[PDB]
Structure formats: C-alpha cells, structure tokens
Amino acid sequence: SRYFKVTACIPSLKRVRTGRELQNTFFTKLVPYENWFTEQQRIQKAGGKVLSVKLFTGVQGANTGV
C-alpha cells in the first residue's frame, strides 16, 4: 500500500497544557494513503501547518498494486 511521510506543526490555541506536548506539536510520521486525507484535514482544523508531504512507498499513477 502507498504510504505518506508527513511533517507538520500543530499549535494548542484552545487550552494551555502542563504535560509536555512537544511530540504532538512537531510530528514527522508515516501515514497510510487512505488515512492521510482525514489526517490532513485534522491538522488543518487544528490550525496546524503541514510543512512537508512525501509519498514514502508506492508508485504515483499506478493503476494496480495500489
């Protein structure tokens, strides 16, 4: 399956949190292609900015094996 490597930064505008949030704030992650759409939306809704997106696995414009 196609996989996405995503780097994004998210700010906590609603509430101040005592516990360390640094992992949540800046998170380079591998996302399944199917999941990424929803994940991208979630980052946008948070007001976080997605710094970089790359397709880690799979071939672009492949009809099958996707």
């Binding site: 997106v53 672009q60 009809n63």
Partner: protein, 161 residues
C-alpha cells in the same frame, strides 16, 4: 480561520487601538454585502451536485484524463477528482460568507500543492475545473453574488498555480 469582521478586529488588536470610524466603515461595508452572500450560499448548496456535474462536463470528462493512462482514469481516481471538486466548492462558499480568503489558505491551500505533486495530479487541469465551476456558479447566484463568488474561486486557482 478569520472572517472580515474578525480580520479588522485582529489588525486593531495588534496595534492595541480602539475601533475607529475608518475601521467601522469597513465593517459597515461587510454588513450590507452580508444579505446577498447568504442568499448566494443557499443557491450554491442546493445546486452543488449539478454545479460539479456541469463543470466536469465542461473540462474534465470526454478528455484524455478520463481515457486510459489519464489521471482521472479508473473509477477510484474519477471519484477522487469529483470529491476534490466538491471540497473546493464547499470552501469557496464558506469563504464567500466569511468575506475573507484566509480559510482557503488555512484548510484548502495548505499542503495541497505538495500532495498533488507527490500524487502527480495535474495542477492546470484542476485549475481549469475550478474556473469551470466558477462560471456555472456565476449563472446560478446571479449578478449581486457572482462578483463576490468569483474572487474566492480565483483565489483558489491562483494558489494552486
């Protein structure tokens, strides 16, 4: 995101200035436009499916894209493209109500370029589709609304290109 009213407020807040007449005038301008915008939004929501259909017919379909080896070939890709078209329409409607382009930047425009480049989706074709939607929308909304609607569609197009 921001709206026109909040945008004025935010600019004043960073200055620390109390709201002034010049600021008030901008707010007043928005308030008059508001009623028109609400009517336009309702029109778009009701005709959304058709708007997408017409726009696709104008640009996307009966083309190399739909033919094998084209980006929108296969049902899965076709469905994806029309889903994206719907997104653009919904967000443009939101922007029109808001009176501010910022929401487009915050939600639609951010990260889309990178996604599309990895996917190999063709930007110019997408832009073409957006422009087509604009034309269809312009008709339905009418004169009062079309000018307002057009700017947000153009904003999306400029961002992508």
């Amino acid at each position: 995101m921001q709206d026109a009213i909040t945008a004025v407020i935010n600019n004043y807040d960073v200055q620390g200035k109390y709201l002034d007449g010049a600021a008030l005038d901008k707010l007043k301008a928005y308030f008059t436009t508001g009623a028109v915008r609400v009517r336009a939004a309702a029109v778009i929501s009701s005709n959304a499916t058709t708007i997408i259909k017409e726009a696709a017919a104008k640009a996307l379909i009966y083309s190399d894209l739909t033919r094998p080896g084209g980006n929108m070939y296969t049902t899965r890709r076709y469905a994806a493209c029309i889903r994206d078209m719907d997104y653009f329409l919904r967000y443009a409607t939101y922007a029109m109500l808001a009176g501010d382009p910022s929401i487009l930047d915050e939600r639609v425009l951010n990260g889309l370029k990178e996604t599309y480049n990895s996917l190999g989706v063709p930007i110019a074709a997408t832009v073409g589709g957006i422009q087509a939607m604009k034309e269809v929308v312009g008709g339905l909304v009418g004169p009062d609304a079309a000018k307002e609607a057009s700017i947000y569609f153009d904003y999306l197009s400029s961002g992508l290109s």
